[PDB]
Known about the structure:
This is part of a larger assembly, with nine protein chains of eight kinds.
Chain C: H1 2-24, H2 29-42, H3 45-69, H4 75-113, H5 116-122, H6 127-164, H7 170-175, H8 177-180, H9 183-209, H10 217-246
Chain E: H1 9-28
Chain F: H1 6-29, H2 32-36
PDB class: membrane protein
Keywords: Membrane protein complex, Virulence factor, Lipid transport
Entry title: Structure of Mce1-LucB complex from Mycobacterium smegmatis (Map1)
Amino acid sequence: SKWLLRGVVFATAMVIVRLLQGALVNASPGNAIWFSTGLLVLYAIGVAVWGVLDGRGDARSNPDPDRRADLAMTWLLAGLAAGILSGAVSWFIGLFYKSIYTESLLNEITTFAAFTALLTFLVAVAGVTIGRWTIDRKAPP
Amino acid sequence: RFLDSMGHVAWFVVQAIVHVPHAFRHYRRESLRLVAEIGMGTGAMAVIGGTVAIIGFVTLSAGSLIAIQGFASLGNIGVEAFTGFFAALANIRVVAPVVTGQALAATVGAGATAELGAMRISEEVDALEVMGIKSISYLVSTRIMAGAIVIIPLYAMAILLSFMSAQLVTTIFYSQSVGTYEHYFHTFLRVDDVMWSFLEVIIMSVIVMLNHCYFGYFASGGAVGVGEAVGRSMRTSLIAIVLVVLLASLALYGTDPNFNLTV
Amino acid sequence: LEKPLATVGGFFKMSVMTGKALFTRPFQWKEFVLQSWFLIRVAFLPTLAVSIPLTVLIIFTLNILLAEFGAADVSGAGAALGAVTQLGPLVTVLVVAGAGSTAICADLGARTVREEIDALEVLGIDPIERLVVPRVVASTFVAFMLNGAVITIGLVGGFFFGVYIQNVSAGAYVSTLTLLTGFPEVLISVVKATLFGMIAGLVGCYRGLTVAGGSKGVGTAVNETLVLCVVALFAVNVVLTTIGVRFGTGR
Amino acid sequence: CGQWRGIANVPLPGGPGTESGSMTLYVQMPETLALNANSRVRVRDVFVGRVRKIELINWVPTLTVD
Amino acid sequence: MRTLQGSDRFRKGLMGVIVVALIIGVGSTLTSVPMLFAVPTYYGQFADTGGLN
Amino acid sequence: MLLTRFIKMQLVIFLTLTLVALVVLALFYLRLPTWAGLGMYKLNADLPNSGG
Amino acid sequence: PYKLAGLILGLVGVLVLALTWMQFRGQFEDKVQLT
Amino acid sequence: GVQIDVTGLSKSFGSSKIWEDVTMSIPAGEVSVLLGPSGTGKSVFLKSLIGLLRPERGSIVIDGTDILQCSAKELYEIRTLFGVLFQDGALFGSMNIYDNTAFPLREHTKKSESEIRKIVMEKLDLVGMPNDGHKFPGEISGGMRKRAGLARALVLDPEIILCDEPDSGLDPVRTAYLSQLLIDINAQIDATVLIVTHNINIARTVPDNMGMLFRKQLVMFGPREVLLTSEEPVVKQFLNGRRIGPIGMSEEKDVPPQLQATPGMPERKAVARRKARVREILHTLPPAAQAAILEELD
Amino acid sequence: GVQIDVTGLSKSFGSSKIWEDVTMSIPAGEVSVLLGPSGTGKSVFLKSLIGLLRPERGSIVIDGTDILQCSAKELYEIRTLFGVLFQDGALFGSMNIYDNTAFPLREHTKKSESEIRKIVMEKLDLVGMPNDGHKFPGEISGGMRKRAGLARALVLDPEIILCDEPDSGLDPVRTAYLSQLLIDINAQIDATVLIVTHNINIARTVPDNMGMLFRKQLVMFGPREVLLTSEEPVVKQFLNGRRIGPIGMSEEKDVPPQLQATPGMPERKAVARRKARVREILHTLPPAAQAAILEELDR
């Protein structure tokens, strides 16, 4: 499943982001917020890049949007799965690692996975639209 | 113009009121059918509960709003054990009567206006007049009787659900002790206030039903005019509901507030 | 459940197309101006005629309860809080869903039953860009303006009523308005008004475009529009009230 | 605009001391203790007047009382 | 319209309701998210809370 | 005349809900027996002052 | 009889408003003033 | 059936008038049809004949009483000898065909349930709906709604029947079926049927009398033999459907053998009285018209 | 004019089907009429031809392109050949007749205001509205509304015209006037006029081709001469308005000279090609029908 693969990749990325953010906040609490935002931007950028590629991977296959597959649903499912899996595994690791900032299991499963999924969905949708519009110009008039 | 319209609506309401015994003695089955239709909705809205479901959801929302805002403000100040004593009063004074009035107006009144407009356009009112049947007595008086029969259960459910929502939000989401909430709720709540609130809601429902039946009975312009009639009836109903509740609360508690805390 | 879910999906797809047309295609200024003025002329006198008695009632109740309590000088705080965070957005909900959303639904249903939507579609025009977008933007703009006016008129009427009728001190009313109301309260009120107007416009337009014709389809569509608007706006109001009290002024 | 000190510090209509025949006095207070305008002027603990302006002149507050 | 009455409304409804639920959840706890607003947490030992919340 | 028995079903379910809601409101929330005086006996007291 | 009915309705509304205002002011009940 | 003597009728919806002066004398028991171009307010005339609408002047007498100016109590008794079929039946969607049909005689007559069922089933089988009494008006077609409205009109033994555009929403075949049913009804119960329509097949085949409304006036009313042999340009143009004539492109710019009642039905008493009346009138007609009518009657 | 092919067309409003296997081939420039009993779903067919509705099955080929398979991007151009007259004209009430007529021009072409006014005045004069362009749709009659809709449809030089129920609310005199106008515009423009109606006067004088729908089926489609000399019970019942035949009481239970274009108008080329095809069809007609068609064509 494409959505499953994207969700696993983005869950691993979010876990790495959480580990790096925890280490940076513990090292220098003063700039902590900045570090977090920076890492988040990186995460977003990554998603965006893939989204752009995916847009091309759609827009080359079909010359019109109607024949194109609905990538929005796939990216929404991938983001939701990434958020849920990342929250669950981060909560599991946090039981043995105190540097991460993990809340209760239900919170990480639902409330913060919602944030992760929404951010991933919005970035992926923007990237897919930009990728399709990249070669929309190249389409014959 | 304005005087002519006032006279027309006055004649309509007078003729609708004076025919209530006629519909009571002659159209009992129609009254029961309209009671069922108003209580359980009609069309695509009847599958979810009709009027009951909409009233319940809106009253639950209003009670949750009361509980959340009151508990937040009192916790910020510090005296947060009074929350129930606050919420009850609000639910009897301002929130539940007006909110139930607006929801009842929307659902029941818009349905009645749409039905009467469809009957007027489809020449069913003319069909009734041809068959020697008082169209106003058959339709408007029956709607008024059904609304009067159905309003007391509807407002009882509205009050119950508002109280339940406020208590649940305060004592579950905010983790306040149920005993303190029940004490401050039952200590400062007077049944006299609830009885007068029920009287207000009954009068308000009668006025709303009369207004919506007036707007839907004289509909014109084909199917297009029905929507405009619904909108105008809704505006008038909102104004009338707020004005009636204001006047009743000013009259009842103008001199005696019916509330004692200090000496 | 499948049919209501399909209707919800149609509404969401229509709203997404409306947003895409707003952010991509050129904007219709003439239609936006016309719809803004229409909404103002249909829902300006009712919103004041509903806000004034409601705020007078709230002020009367608060004043009598506080006077019996003993703290009658802190009535301005509760007055300002209620008028800003709840009374304004709720009167906006009522007088927008009842008047403007129903008028939009009736107008678009009239266009649909008269085959004017089909007339636009056969000419190659997408009716969404030409019709829905100006109406949604006008709904949002009018909701914002009406919320501001409702809050101001409610506060002024409460002041006048409390001072000249219940003989409370004017200085206690005006100096306590800012005690519990601040920038977060007005900001969340503005957010509430904008979201309420946008949702009301979207629901009205979607119900108007999908009218069933017949002899009662327009009236049924308007009634369903009104019910859906009331339910959705109350739910959104609950959510936004929770969010706002999280960022409270006193805390 | 320039002298806007807030909604609490603007004179308000009505009340004792605002009708015709009311007399205006200037009270040179050592300090005002964060007193706002439109506050109550009391004789024998009876509210019979209003304070209009609390402008500070030469760093000694002066209150206009009607 | 043809576009509104298409045979894809179920997937659109699922996606839209999930998106709206996600937006509501994010708005509810926009400040409490640890991946965005994280600060070190210190601890202290006390004899009594003393009404602390 | 009429008697579709679906209207009858709506009527009976509405009546059941009405009775349940009215009884619950009367007993557990309004406490009508307490207000009326059911199951209680009357007592009096004399005070030097009301004490508020 | 439209004009007469409208006049009656307006008179009824004005009387209702006057009565509720008098009840708010407590005009009906009589009390004694002590100095 | 009973005679309707309209005289000096005039309707005006504000400044714009519908017709100026309509003077009729509808024969008792004979089918009559009113014709005209679009926008001439024929349905307004149909409504005004029963008292739903109020013409500004004129008089409409059923039997010997002017129903235009009479106490409202007597109107609900005058309308007892009436049966109206609207453009779509005007049925009530809350109750099925059986209850819709039984409503007029449930309200007035103090009859038992079994007699009510007998008469309702009889009148439902009369209009070609034997076993469709349990269906609601929303589950049937427009022609079925017209049949149900007619059946509801036939329960209380009407003396006058009004038909409002029977051709609406029906092709020529089903319109021919409904016209045959109307002729059968008049042959059986002998009720004064009056129809308002602009159809030509109905105009030439169904009625015993015909009238014409053109330019907010009444052109002429008379038996089918008189009108179908008329030299009036408007009447000839409309009846033959000619493009060339006084009738313009829009409102601003302005002998058939007749179908017989179904074999087995009682002999239609309207035909003989119509023939006698046209025989009496014949001596005041153009010689060509007189010759044509004499040839038709023989 | 352009030939329109329809192959295996089917429709369904839910479980119930409107019609199925509607196969036909509308010629180029020839006035054609689709008729049948009420409730057969003919306006649905008319709307499905242009693309307002999406049939469940079939193929509608216009100028060699399957209009049901073409994407929405291409449909912006295919509908340029079309001109649609609805039952009430579907005029926009917010703008007057002049603006309604000029609207497709201002939306598609790049012409100046003077050329727009010239074309609009010419087309309003064509449909008998020379000095009536300043009125609004809400203050004109139904016939004038149909004329204004036709005028709006006649400004972009359409190759296909779809008239939906031109007889609605019109007495036979005004219907005859509108039919004469449609014959004239087909004479002048050769624009493949297609009409949907159950009228008999229209379906005996106007068309060059006719088809009939009965019980969710197409009984026959063919030229005027072939359809007016067919011994088919449904067609012979309907075209004469008889009472005895397959068509029942209601939906639940189921040659005349052609209108000649007015003098002072260009010769119609539809009649010649229609007769040329009629001869090839007569090659396979029944002998009585063959004799009738030979008598008719040789007048």
